Design a protein around this ligand. Structure first.
Ligand code: HEM
Ligand code: HEM
Ligand code: HEM
Ligand code: HEM
Lengths: 132, 142, 142, 132
C-alpha cells in the first residue's frame, strides 16, 4: 500500500527494539485468555503457545522487510491457516489487538499515538494478506 | 454479561487506576483522534483537536467520568447509561460503530500506564465491561 | 434490548412464517455453506454438505427449532438459550463470529419467501431479535 | 480481483434484470429504517432518499461494467463520501446488506445461493473501493 518514509522508519524502529521471545508469547497468551475460543487451536506457561507466539512475530518480521509486497508475502501462510488450520479470519484481528496492547505495555510512553497508527496500519495490511 | 468475578475485577482495577483518570481520558481521546481520523468530525466544533489540547484534556475527564459512572452502575449498565445513550444517539448522533474504537484506545492507554496491573485477567473483565458499556450506549439507537 | 413493539412484531411475523420453518432452515443453512465456505468445517462430519442434502434439511429443522424457542423465550433470551450457548461454546466450539453470518442468511431466506410480509418494520425488529439471539448464544464463551 | 466467467455472467444477468428505480429506493429506505443512524445523512416516500437510492445502483452499474478495475473506479466517490459527506465506512456494509435483502425479495427463488455469492463478492469489492 502507500507507506511514508516516516512509517517505514517507525515500523523499522519498533521491530529493532522488540524482543520477539518476550512479545510473541505474551501477545498470544493474552489472546487465548481474552478471547478463549482461540484456545481451541492449541496458557501463560505453555511452551507450545510460546513457540507459536514467537513464530507470529517472526512472520511479521518478513512483512516488515518487504513492506511493498505485503500482500504476496503471506500466500503460503494465508493458505496454511485457512485450508489446513481452519482458523476463522476474525481471529487475526483479535491477535493483532493483543499484539498492540502487549507492545504498548512494553514501550510505555514511547508508544505514541503516531507509533500506534503506523503499527496498526502495518498489522491491518498483514491481517488482510492473511485473509486474502 | 458480567459475572461477579468480572465486577470484582473491574472495581479492583478501577480502584487502582482511577487516580489517573484525567490522564487516561486525555491520552485515549488523543489516540482515537490521531489513529482513527474519521472520528475527528465529531469534535470539529472545537478549535484545537490536536493531542493534549485543552479541549481534549477537558473532555477526557468527562469521558472517564462516564466510565466511573458505569463502574458504579455495573450491576445494570442499561439503566445506568440510558441518558448517555439517548445523548449519543439523538443529540450528538454519534455513529455507534465508533464506541468499539474508543474502547480499544482506552485499553491501549491503560496498558501503557499500568503494565503491572493490566494483566490478561484484568483485560478480559475490562474488555467484557467495555463491551457492555458500548452495548448500553447503543441501547437508544433503534 | 427488545421493546414490546419489537416482541409483538417478532411474534406476529413468526406466526405467519413459522409454517415454512423447515424450508427456511434448509435454505438458510444451504446459503451459509455456499456463500461463506469457512463455515463448512463445522459440518465436515456429515457425508453430504451440499445444498438441499438430507443432513442439511434435517439440521435446518433443528436450527429453526432453536429460533422458535427463542421467540417463546423472547422476554429473557439469556436464560432461554443458556443451554444452546454452552453447547456452541464448549461442546461444538463454534467460533462466535459465525452467529452474525447465519443470521444474515436467515434474513435473506425470509426475504425470498415472504416478500410481502418481510417489511422494513418487520426487518428492524427481527434484526434486533437475531442480534439478541447471537448475543445470548455468545453468553457462555467468556 | 479474481472473477470467474460464471461470476461475470451472473452479475451481468442480475444487473440486466434489475429495475434501478425499484431496487434503489427500496434498499436505501430499508437501510434508514433498519439502521436509523444513517438517517442523519439525509422515509419510504422521501424523493431525496429515492434519488440517492437510484444513484447508488447507478454507481454499482459503473463497477459492473469494468469489474477488473473496481478499486480505481471509485476514487471520486470514495473521497466524496469520506472527505465531503463524512459517511462512516461501516455504513457501506449496512447498505450492501439491504441491497442484498431487497434484491432477494424481488428475485425470489431465482436468487440462488450461487447468485447471492457472486453478488456479495461484487458488493464486497465495491465497499472496499469506497473505504479505500
Ligand atoms: C496474525 C498472524 C499470524 C501469523 C503471522 C502466524 C504465523 C504462523 C507461522 C509462522 C506458523 C508456522 C507454520 C509452519 O510450521 O511452517 C503458524 C502455525 C500455526 N498457527 Fe499461526 N499465525 C498467525 C495467526 C494465527 C491465529 C489467529 C491462530 C489461531 C489462534 C493461529 C494458529 C496456528 C496454529 C495452531 C499453527 C499450527 C501449529 C504450529 O506450528 O504452531 N495462527 N502460524
Ligand atoms: C464508550 C465511551 C463513551 C462514553 C463513556 C462517553 C461519554 C460522554 C460524556 C459523559 C459526554 C459528556 C456529556 C455531557 O457533558 O453532558 C460525552 C459527550 C460527547 N461524546 Fe461521548 N462517550 C463515549 C463515546 C463516544 C464516542 C466513541 C464518540 C465519538 C467518536 C463520542 C462523541 C461525543 C461527543 C462529540 C460529545 C460532545 C462533545 C462536546 O461538544 O463537548 N463519545 N460523551
Ligand atoms: C444463530 C442461530 C443458531 C441456533 C439457533 C443454533 C441452534 C442449534 C441447535 C438447536 C442445535 C442442535 C443441538 C441438539 O440437537 O442438541 C445446533 C447444533 C449445531 N450447531 Fe448451531 N445454532 C446456531 C448457530 C450456529 C452457527 C452459526 C454454527 C456454525 C457455523 C453452528 C453450528 C452447529 C453445529 C456444528 C451443530 C451440531 C451439528 C451436528 O452435529 O448435527 N450453529 N445448533
Ligand atoms: C455503497 C454505495 C454507495 C454508492 C455507490 C453511492 C453513490 C453516490 C452517488 C453517485 C452520489 C452522487 C454524487 C454526486 O452528486 O456526484 C452520492 C451522494 C451522496 N451519498 Fe452516496 N453512495 C454510497 C453510499 C452511501 C452511504 C452509506 C450513505 C449514507 C447513508 C450515503 C450518503 C450520500 C449523501 C448524503 C450524498 C450527497 C447528497 C446527494 O447528492 O444525494 N451514500 N452517493
Amino acid at each position: 500500500v502507500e507507506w511514508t518514509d516516516k512509517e517505514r522508519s517507525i515500523i523499522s524502529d519498533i521491530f529493532s527494539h522488540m524482543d520477539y521471545d518476550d512479545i510473541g508469547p505474551k501477545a498470544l497468551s493474552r489472546c487465548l485468555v481474552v478471547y478463549p475460543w482461540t484456545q481451541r487451536y492449541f496458557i501463560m506457561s505453555n511452551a507450545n503457545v510460546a513457540a507459536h507466539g514467537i513464530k507470529v512475530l517472526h512472520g511479521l518480521d518478513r512483512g516488515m522487510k518487504n513492506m511493498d509486497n505485503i500482500a504476496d508475502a503471506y500466500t503460503d501462510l494465508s493458505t496454511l491457516h485457512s485450508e489446513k488450520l481452519h482458523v476463522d479470519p476474525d481471529n487475526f484481528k483479535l491477535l493483532s489487538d493483543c499484539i498492540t496492547i502487549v507492545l504498548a505495555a512494553k514501550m510505555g510512553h514511547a508508544f505514541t499515538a503516531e507509533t500506534q497508527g503506523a503499527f496498526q496500519k502495518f498489522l491491518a495490511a498483514v491481517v488482510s494478506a492473511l485473509g486474502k | 454479561s458480567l459475572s461477579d468475578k468480572d465486577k470484582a475485577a473491574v472495581r479492583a482495577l478501577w480502584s487502582k487506576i482511577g487516580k489517573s483518570s484525567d490522564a487516561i481520558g486525555n491520552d485515549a481521546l488523543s489516540r482515537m483522534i490521531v489513529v482513527y481520523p474519521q472520528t475527528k468530525i465529531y469534535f470539529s466544533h472545537w478549535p484545537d483537536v490536536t493531542p493534549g489540547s485543552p479541549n481534549i484534556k477537558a473532555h477526557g475527564k468527562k469521558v472517564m467520568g462516564g466510565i466511573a459512572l458505569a463502574v458504579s452502575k455495573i450491576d445494570d449498565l442499561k439503566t445506568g447509561l440510558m441518558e448517555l445513550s439517548e445523548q449519543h444517539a439523538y443529540k450528538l448522533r454519534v455513529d455507534p460503530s465508533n464506541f468499539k474504537i474508543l474502547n480499544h484506545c482506552i485499553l491501549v492507554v491503560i496498558s501503557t500506564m499500568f503494565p503491572k496491573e493490566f494483566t490478561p485477567e484484568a483485560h478480559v473483565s475490562l474488555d467484557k465491561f467495555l463491551s457492555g458499556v458500548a452495548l448500553a450506549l447503543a441501547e437508544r439507537y433503534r
